Amino acid sequence: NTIHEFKKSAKTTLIKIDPALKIKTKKVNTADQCADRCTRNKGLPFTCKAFVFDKARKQCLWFPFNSMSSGVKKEFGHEFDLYENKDYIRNCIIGKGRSYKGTVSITKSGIKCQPWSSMIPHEHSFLPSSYRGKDLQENYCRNPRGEEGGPWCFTSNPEVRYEVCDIPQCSE
Amino acid sequence: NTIHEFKKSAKTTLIKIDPALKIKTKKVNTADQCADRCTRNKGLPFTCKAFVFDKARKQCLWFPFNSMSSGVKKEFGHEFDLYENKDYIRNCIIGKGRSYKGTVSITKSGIKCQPWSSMIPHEHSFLPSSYRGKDLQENYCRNPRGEEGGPWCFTSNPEVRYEVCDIPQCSE
């Protein structure tokens, strides 16, 4: 249950640069548990905006913040999996969307996006590595060059190399 | 298998008064199919932002827009069930959040909100009727009076009548 309502970020975890932000942990059996208790926000003296699962220990890490939360920071670790609550990941764009990090992965024509890491069915030069920070993960619509047209993605349709995504303006 | 990722509006449906946008429909067994089809956006020439399930006729109505989409009006029908994709329901607030219609239902202390229609554990005068338009449904955080403090809600904790909710500003 409810684990699928979060945005996964493999081999990741966070770091509180601010010693003031609260945290809470526990050791369970599956990440699903972590999800479940976060969705229900039960037993957490704050709003569970995100949680990490440490497969190594088998421990959850509920936070009142997520990767975009200032005073926090991302970091690699093979035993860590980041799960952010979608309600706290901005789902509208301001202007062009250079910073859009939502999880929409469909072109305005309804085509499923192609993973950025993939070269099939379209070979391209937009790799995360060569575009750190623009979050070119999974197959989420992004706009790594902040070009007019806002967020787009390479489509899984061989006949359509790319297309923009229908992502609303916060303005309305 | 995904219906819970949609913000349900019982006995409701949208009218597309503007033959500029299409509407893909299809006789199905359960509403769940509709959801999956809409989630996985499979076989849809657009971005599925909402879908209505015709209990009676047993058919899905996938729309490339939602209740907030300029160009549509919603109505009552015992046989209808409106499911809006959360991805397209602005989840950040502007200012006081007088129009917030997200689905956050947890306080800043992590307390589960009390349904607005309920008078327990807290008796109150906030009725959908009294505040039609403010969308006082389920137990979502709201700011019906556009007060200073942003969205809030009566808590399910008897010892805590109400509390504000931690809902992010679009300009953050």
Side-chain angles (χ1 to χ4, degrees), chain B residues 112-131:
Chain B
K112 185 184 187 185
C113 289
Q114 166 192 311
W116 297 95
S117 77
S118 176
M119 288 297 129
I120 59 185
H122 307 292
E123 185 190 35
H124 64 88
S125 39
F126 293 84
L127 303 185
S129 313
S130 295
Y131 294 107

Side-chain angles (χ1 to χ4, degrees), chain B residues 100-131 133-145:
Chain B
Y100 174 63
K101 305 191 182 307
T103 64
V104 166
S105 57
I106 271 74
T107 58
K108 187 182 173 183
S109 295
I111 311 169
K112 185 184 187 185
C113 289
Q114 166 192 311
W116 297 95
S117 77
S118 176
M119 288 297 129
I120 59 185
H122 307 292
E123 185 190 35
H124 64 88
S125 39
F126 293 84
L127 303 185
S129 313
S130 295
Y131 294 107
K134 265 66 247 315
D135 182 36
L136 284 177
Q137 299 320 300
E138 298 308 308
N139 68 323
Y140 306 129
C141 296
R142 295 285 187 263
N143 194 338
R145 282 158 159 291

Side-chain angles (χ1 to χ4, degrees), chain A residues 6-10 12-14 18-25 28-32 34-36 38-41 43-53 56-77 79-126 128-131 133-141:
Chain A
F6 296 83
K7 172 190 173 188
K8 206 165 177 190
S9 291
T12 310
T13 184
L14 306 152
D18 193 310
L21 315 194
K22 328 169 181 178
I23 296 184
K24 197 200 168 193
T25 66
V28 310
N29 283 171
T30 62
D32 310 290
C34 308
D36 175 26
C38 178
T39 316
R40 303 144 125 271
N41 202 107
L44 312 173
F46 53 69
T47 313
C48 179
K49 305 188 181 182
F51 80 75
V52 172
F53 180 58
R57 313 179 165 183
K58 277 201 172 191
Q59 164 200 59
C60 307
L61 284 73
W62 299 288
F63 317 107
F65 55 70
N66 63 19
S67 59
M68 294 92 220
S69 294
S70 64
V72 186
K73 298 180 177 207
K74 323 187 182 191
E75 184 169 288
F76 183 94
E79 74 284 47
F80 299 134
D81 273 348
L82 182 44
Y83 288 47
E84 299 171 297
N85 184 325
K86 289 181 189 179
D87 291 313
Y88 298 93
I89 294 175
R90 196 187 309 111
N91 54 22
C92 53
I93 58 174
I94 311 295
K96 294 206 243 297
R98 323 74 184 187
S99 66
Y100 167 75
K101 288 167 177 163
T103 64
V104 168
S105 51
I106 262 74
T107 59
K108 79 173 179 187
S109 288
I111 305 175
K112 179 175 189 174
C113 290
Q114 170 188 321
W116 297 93
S117 64
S118 167
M119 291 297 134
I120 305 176
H122 301 91
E123 182 172 66
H124 72 280
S125 299
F126 288 90
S129 9
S130 89
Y131 273 113
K134 286 302 195 295
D135 188 33
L136 295 181
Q137 272 316 321
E138 304 305 295
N139 67 319
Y140 310 130
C141 302

Side-chain angles (χ1 to χ4, degrees), chain B residues 144-161:
Chain B
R145 282 158 159 291
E147 299 162 53
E148 171 71 55
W152 58 281
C153 77
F154 292 104
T155 100
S156 50
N157 184 314
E159 288 337 306
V160 199
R161 186 178 173 71

